[PDB]
Amino acid sequence: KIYTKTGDKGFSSTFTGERRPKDDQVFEAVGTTDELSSAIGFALELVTEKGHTFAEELQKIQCTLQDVGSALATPCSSAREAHLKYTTFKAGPILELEQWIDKYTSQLPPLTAFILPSGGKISSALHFCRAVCRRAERRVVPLVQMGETDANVAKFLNRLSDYLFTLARYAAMKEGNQEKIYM
Amino acid sequence: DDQVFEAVGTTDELSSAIGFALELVTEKGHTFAEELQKIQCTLQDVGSALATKYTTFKAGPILELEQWIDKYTSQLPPLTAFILPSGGKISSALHFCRAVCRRAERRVVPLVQMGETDANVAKFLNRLSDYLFTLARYAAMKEGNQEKIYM
Amino acid sequence: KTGDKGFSSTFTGERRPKDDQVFEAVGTTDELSSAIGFALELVTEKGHTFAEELQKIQCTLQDVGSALATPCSSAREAHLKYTTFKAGPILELEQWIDKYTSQLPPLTAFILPSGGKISSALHFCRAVCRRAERRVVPLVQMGETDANVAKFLNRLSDYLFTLARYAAMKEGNQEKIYMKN
Numbered sequence: 396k397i398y399t400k401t402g403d404k405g406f407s408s409t410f411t412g413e414r415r416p417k418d419d420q421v422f423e424a425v426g427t428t429d430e431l432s433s434a435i436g437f438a439l440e441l442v443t444e445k446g447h448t449f450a451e452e453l454q455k456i457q458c459t460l461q462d463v464g465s466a467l468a469t470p471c472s473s474a475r476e477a478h479l480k481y482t483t484f485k486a487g488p489i490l491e492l493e494q495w496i497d498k499y500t501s502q503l504p505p506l507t508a509f510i511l512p513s514g515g516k517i518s519s520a521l522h523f524c525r526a527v528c529r530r531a532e533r534r535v536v537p538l539v540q541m542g543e544t545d546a547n548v549a550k551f552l553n554r555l556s557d558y559l560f561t562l563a564r565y566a567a568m569k570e571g572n573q574e575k576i577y578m
Numbered sequence: 579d580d581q582v583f584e585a586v587g588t589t590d591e592l593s594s595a596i597g598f599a600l601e602l603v604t605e606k607g608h609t610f611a612e613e614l615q616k617i618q619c620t621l622q623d624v625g626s627a628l629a630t631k632y633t634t635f636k637a638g639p640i641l642e643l644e645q646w647i648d649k650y651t652s653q654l655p656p657l658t659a660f661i662l663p664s665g666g667k668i669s670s671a672l673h674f675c676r677a678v679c680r681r682a683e684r685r686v687v688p689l690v691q692m693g694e695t696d697a698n699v700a701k702f703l704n705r706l707s708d709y710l711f712t713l714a715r716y717a718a719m720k721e722g723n724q725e726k727i728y729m
Numbered sequence: 730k731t732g733d734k735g736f737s738s739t740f741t742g743e744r745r746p747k748d749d750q751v752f753e754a755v756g757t758t759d760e761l762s763s764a765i766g767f768a769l770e771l772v773t774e775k776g777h778t779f780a781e782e783l784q785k786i787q788c789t790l791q792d793v794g795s796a797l798a799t800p801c802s803s804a805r806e807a808h809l810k811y812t813t814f815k816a817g818p819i820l821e822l823e824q825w826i827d828k829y830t831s832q833l834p835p836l837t838a839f840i841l842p843s844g845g846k847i848s849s850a851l852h853f854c855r856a857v858c859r860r861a862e863r864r865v866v867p868l869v870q871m872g873e874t875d876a877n878v879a880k881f882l883n884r885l886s887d888y889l890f891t892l893a894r895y896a897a898m899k900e901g902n903q904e905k906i907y908m909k910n
């Protein structure tokens with residue numbers, strides 16, 4: 396059977412084998428990363444045409460988010476206690492995001508003021524993804540400040556926020572949609 | 579402070595949800611589309627007021643919300659029980675926006691009770707949940723869609 | 730205008746600030762039900778029975794909302810129908826899961842949220858359901874909420890995963906599969 400029922404009393408396992416209540420910050424961080432990945436999946440379902448580079452990029456990002464969830468599930472202090480290795484989150488994906496950000500940023504008109512979330516279906520979906528990503532970042536920061544998670548995880552999520560904002564503007568520009576401003 | 583960051587992020591999440599909902603209106607000329615965009619602007623104001631001993635936040639938008647609520651209420655049949663979140667694409671999206679707005683209100687309340695932000699922000703988010711509920715009902719009615727009540 | 734001050738009431742008459750755990754739990758259950766509503770608005774084109782199932786789940790979520798709003802420490806006798814959350818719905822979920830499991834190919838690798846609009850929407854619903862479970866667990870481990878509520882949410886996570894897989898299979902969509910590096 397797909398379920399075990401071992402979590403019916405409200406406890407679950409980390410990747411170090413330690414059992415904690417399901418409201419622990421480790422599970423809040425893992426679950427919010429999962430929620431971000433799901434929002435990105437639904438946004439991916441909105442692309443009308445085929446062969447879009449940024450769709451491949453978003454799928455790569457989803458895989459990286461699975462890796463980020465795995466990292467968050469192995470707290471470093473319990474990995475030292477459990478005799479396990481370090482759980483080092485590498486910087487590759489961050490640099491990749493920075494490259495893609497430069498690519499899209501070089502193509503947009505300069506932006507000076509606040510944007511209302513808008514610009515077509517894809518663009519609005521990506522703005523919602525951006526807000527969920529920032530929530531995930533806020534869930535990861537306390538774990539970093541405790542020494543439980545590599546700081547590169549928070550760096551990746553922070554850079555993904557900017558990637559999603561820039562990609563929303565890029566999609567809006569390509570659709571001929573103008574986004575709104577003011578008060 | 580972390581609470582300020584959380585409240586601001588949740589108001590931003592609400593505005594983004596409302597934007598995606600707006601993307602579901604297939605016709606132009608809808609007054610409530612303009613109302614939702616004006617609400618997005620007011621949410622920008624809410625976010626700047628939270629990121630301040632606190633910033634003043636005028637109460638006019640709350641009256642705007644109450645007027646719109648009355649306008650829509652006088653067009654709807656009486657409702658005495660809970661309904662299932664439903665009623666067409668726009669109505670369902672607006673129910674989800676209503677849930678996110680109530681989450682944002684929960685994030686703003688402790689800031690107000692600490693005296694770190696103006697109470698009008700909190701009562702705006704409150705009235706806003708009510709506006710979103712009424713507008714979801716109204717959008718469902720205008721499409722001829724069925725209002726599901728479970729007992 | 731009641732509650733403009735930041736306070737609200739439980740169904741037992743207790744007044745608490747709106748940031749209390751009970752309101753976080755009830756609000757997240759509401760959010761889950763609304764996400765299911767939107768997913769249902771995508772489903773109403775073809776797929777039949779599982780739309781009935783999703784609506785039943787919404788009704789059950791209204792019942793769990795009633796349970797969470799009636800803390801056991803304050804519950805009088807006339808509130809006993811609300812504090813007792815029966816196990817029926819849980820078993821129903823298991824039944825439905827078994828049904829869909831008999832029609833799917835066996836699962837070997839990790840799945841990315843994908844598989845068409847219905848499937849992706851259900852994956853998002855699953856994530857919101859797990860957030861709701863995390864909000865309900867502190868009330869249960871405090872003795873304020875029937876444990877069957879947490880059991881129901883834990884099983885609903887798996888129901889939604891399996892239903893996403895089923896919708897993707899019926900639409901002919903292949904889900905995307907996790908790949909290292």
Ligand code: B12
Pocket residue numbers: 506507508509510511512525556557560586587590621622623625626627629
């Ligand atoms: C609170 C805050 C937010 C809140 C709410 C903001 C709101 N009012 O709706 C939230 C979380 C929503 C937010 C989001 C973003 N913000 Co912000 N935010 C701020 C903060 C702390 C104050 C802004 C504010 O409310 N000012 C008060 C109002 C009245 O001012 P305003 O007249 O509208 O003028 C502002 C803009 O013109 C902005 N501005 C100036 N230069 C630039 C350049 C660019 C490229 C942009 C986009 C804006 C911008 O700064 C002015 C003063 O704040 C500022 C930092 C600061 N400047 O003190 C950052 C700041 C404005 N934000 C910034 C960024 C990057 C963003 C995001 C793109 C981040 C993201 N990845 O999501 C989004 C934008 C999404 C959107 N437009 O909806 C940057 C902008 C410059 C840049 N480096 O690109 C700032 C300056 C922070 C920084 N120093 O890096 N933000």
Ligand code: B12
Pocket residue numbers: 657658659660661662663676707708711738739740755756759790791792793794795798
């Ligand atoms: C817990 C709670 C919630 C939970 C819901 C839990 C659930 N069971 O689904 C959440 C946070 C989701 C919620 C949402 C809302 N609720 Co509420 N909620 C309550 C509360 C505290 C208890 C309700 C309950 O579980 N009763 C037990 C069940 C078994 O009772 P029931 O047989 O179904 O009977 C109830 C309904 O008929 C309700 N009722 C009576 N008149 C009206 C009118 C409307 C419009 C509605 C929706 C319900 C309603 O009152 C009865 C007794 O509780 C009550 C206040 C109270 N009763 O002390 C407010 C209350 C029922 N809610 C109210 C409101 C306004 C809402 C919202 C519209 C708020 C919003 N803007 O989103 C939504 C509606 C969502 C929907 N209909 O789908 C109002 C209803 C009256 C009114 N002011 O119009 C109440 C009375 C609070 C108040 N005094 O303002 N709520």
Ligand SMILES: Nc1ncnc2c1ncn2[C@@H]1O[C@H](COP(=O)(O)OP(=O)(O)OP(=O)(O)O)[C@@H](O)[C@H]1O
Pocket residue numbers: 397398399400401402403406407408409410417422423425426468859860862863883886
């Ligand atoms: N509600 C939740 N929110 C976030 N993460 C969770 C939640 N529940 C479990 N997890 C994490 O995801 C992993 C898989 O979840 P799963 O639901 O399969 O486990 P469980 O609920 O503890 O067991 P079961 O569901 O079989 O009773 C768990 O090992 C745990 O680390």
Ligand SMILES: C[C@H]1O[C@@H](n2cnc3c(N)ncnc32)[C@H](O)[C@@H]1O
Pocket residue numbers: 528529530532533583584586587
């Ligand atoms: C735009 C402004 O939002 C704040 N900020 C930075 N990261 C987050 C986040 N994850 N959530 C909410 N607010 C954030 C910073 O103060 C920045 O300047």
Ligand SMILES: C[C@H]1O[C@@H](n2cnc3c(N)ncnc32)[C@H](O)[C@@H]1O
Pocket residue numbers: 680681683684737738739747752753755756
């Ligand atoms: C309808 C019922 O919902 C609860 N309630 C009131 N405000 C909120 C909020 N922001 N978030 C969640 N629940 C709330 C109260 O118990 C109210 O009576």
Ligand SMILES: [Mg+2]
Pocket residue numbers: 397398399
């Ligand atoms: Mg499992």
Ligand SMILES: [Mg+2]
Pocket residue numbers: 704705707708732
């Ligand atoms: Mg209210």
Ligand SMILES: [Mg+2]
Pocket residue numbers: 402883884886
């Ligand atoms: Mg589980």
